[PDB]
Write a protein that binds this ligand. Structure first.
Ligand SMILES: CC[C@H]1[C@@H](O)[C@@H]2[C@H](CC[C@]3(C)[C@@H]([C@H](C)CCC(=O)O)CC[C@@H]23)[C@@]2(C)CC[C@@H](O)C[C@@H]12
Lengths: 229, 12
């Protein structure tokens, strides 16, 4: 049950920063009330995603060292992580602890919302898989944290400067792995795995986009820019 | 040009 002071600080700071913003009540219950419609569901889901993107961009702005990085690189990392992050969040939301409320319902909206059942089946498989890992808020926070902090992102001019900030997070997730799940482990390798995994999922994602349609509705200008089009 | 994101980066 190790965990140095420098680490617990970081984890405490990150876990603080992780649960601050949160999804606005309005957009949230919007899935509980209001009803179905392949076009409505698309609007709801497409609204949220636009929100999540705002939240995320705040979290990454208050992640140790972040504002210290070259301005361009900062974009890059955000442009770079936006989807994957959402995947993790998506993961976190779905599997694990059913608060017996809206979430199980969120899946219905996704199911039949102009999204081909050929993409929601493998995707919802992946999520079930990370679910097998039985993670904790901390892991999700760190995973998201380390993912936003990837030096191997298509355009960042200075990778060393990004790593410095990434390693610490990485070292905290690792030692955090032994502790919560020592039975194996490999669990820390497995996780870094899913990271490499969702990276190819960002690939199926841009494709499935150009085929998602729904009447003729459009994507919020933000998504159009962070989901390319 | 990622103008929307930039705007969200600097004071959201
Ligand atoms: C088949 C899988 C779906 C879920 O992962 C959906 C995303 C859209 C964004 C969400 C609605 C996420 C939401 C913005 C999280 C909000 C929060 O912060 O709580 C969680 C569930 C996500 C779809 C439709 C669209 C993008 C595709 O890659 C995955 C789809």
């Amino acid at each position: 049950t190790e965990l140095t002071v420098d680490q617990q600080t970081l984890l405490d700071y990150i876990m603080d920063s992780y649960s601050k913003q949160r999804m606005p009540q309005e957009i949230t219950n919007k899935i509980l009330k209001e009803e179905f419609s392949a076009e409505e569901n698309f609007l709801i889901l497409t609204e949220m995603a636009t929100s999540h993107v705002q939240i995320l961009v705040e979290f990454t702005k208050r992640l140790p060292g972040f504002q210290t990085l070259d301005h361009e690189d900062q974009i890059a990392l955000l442009k770079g992580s936006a989807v994957e992050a959402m995947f993790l969040r998506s993961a976190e939301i779905f599997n694990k602890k059913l608060p017996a409320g809206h979430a199980d319902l969120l899946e219905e909206r996704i199911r039949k919302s102009g999204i081909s059942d050929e993409y929601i089946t493998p995707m919802f498989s992946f999520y079930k898989s990370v679910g097998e890992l039985k993670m904790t808020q901390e892991e999700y926070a760190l995973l998201t944290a380390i993912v936003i902090l990837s030096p191997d992102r298509q355009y960042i001019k200075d990778r060393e400067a990004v790593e410095k900030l990434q390693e610490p997070l990485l070292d905290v997730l690792q030692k955090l792995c032994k502790i919560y799940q020592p039975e194996n482990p490999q669990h820390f390798a497995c996780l870094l795995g899913r990271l490499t995994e969702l990276r190819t999922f960002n690939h199926h994602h841009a494709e499935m986009l150009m085929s998602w349609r729904v009447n003729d509705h459009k994507f919020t200008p933000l998504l159009c820019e962070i989901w390319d089009v | 040009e990622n103008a929307l994101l930039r705007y969200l980066l600097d004071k959201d």
